[PDB]
Assembly symmetry: C2
Homo-oligomer: 97 residues x 2
């Protein structure tokens, strides 16, 4: 199944919401993994796309989201519907109308 | 100066209108910026490899996508002027003098 890796800034309603949205999504059975520059710094050096994004965009460009290794978003977090669409999960399964 | 390519998805947001104001500021003073959309330049979305992989991974709903010297720098929203200033190395304007 698809995996989303989220490379977060070191660490607002946006983040509050995302954390909520990650809960609905995981519980529908999807695989989401988060990495933070503060607690998992090597994950950022060891991933080639992440390293190169940070060189290109700067760390202020984060978050970077990769779905099965591919960039799908950078510079903000997705809405719950955006998540659902990436994961092919029906709306009514992740608390949305 | 790095070069910027913008792959655009709509009817006039606002951050849309600010971004296009920000584009002139950058063009009027130096920067090469090319913009592409699927209504007018759809061949560019298949011919640029990172753009093509992006659409397949994210969906076209994932636009915009911004490349700086062909490197992904943002996707899913437009950059503010201060972000562009950082990408391009545009220095702070001086005022002059705190105690």
């Amino acid at each position: 199944m698809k995996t989303l890796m989220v490379f977060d800034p070191a660490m607002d309603q946006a983040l509050v919401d995302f954390s909520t949205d990650v809960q609905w999504l995981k519980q529908c059975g999807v695989q989401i993994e988060r990495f933070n520059l503060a607690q998992q710094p090597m994950s950022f050096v060891q991933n080639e796309k992440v390293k190169a994004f940070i060189e290109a965009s700067g760390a202020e460009g984060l978050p970077l989201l990769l779905l099965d290794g591919e960039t799908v978003m950078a510079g903000r977090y997705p809405k719950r519907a955006e998540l659902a669409r990436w994961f092919g999960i029906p709306l009514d399964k992740v608390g949305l109308a």
